[PDB]
Amino acid sequence: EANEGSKTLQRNRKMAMGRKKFNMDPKKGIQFLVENELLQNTPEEIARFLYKGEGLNKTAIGDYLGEREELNLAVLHAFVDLHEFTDLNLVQALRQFLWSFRLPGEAQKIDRMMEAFAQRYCLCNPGVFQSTDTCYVLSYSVIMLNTDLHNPNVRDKMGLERFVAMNRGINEGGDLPEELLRNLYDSIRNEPFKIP
């Protein structure tokens, strides 16, 4: 006679095993979970698992999201869609996003994440930016500013006035508010990004 409590206990052990396998080798971890019917092999379901992140290494999460593979790309889109950026300013939203995983080192991986982020930010906050290219450019400006201001290996530091000068043109056929740019600058300047 089948004992469902036994089934649950075995499943818990397998899930614990799967998380541990994921932290070593994200694709292997996901394949194991999928094969044992512990996770559905759908972009949305895998994205929900990584967004919850229970006992998952955020560098592993990032590495999974940065694979240039059809499924992983679908997962990255779904994962960014689980974020809630409505009513946040760009730095506030970036802080939420960049807490949920550790960015890969590779520029192309970062780029795909940053494009996805910018498109989702603009959809959640229509009319803040006149295009997604503007928000993409400005999201990099903010990430680079965090690096420039808070990594001491970057010698000479960019001041507010220069940051505003670089970025005021990037909107459309007319500049943004310089209010919005000063707000982003000071935010980063006074609180670096919290990274995992």
Ligand SMILES: [Mn+2]
């Ligand atoms: Mn501070």
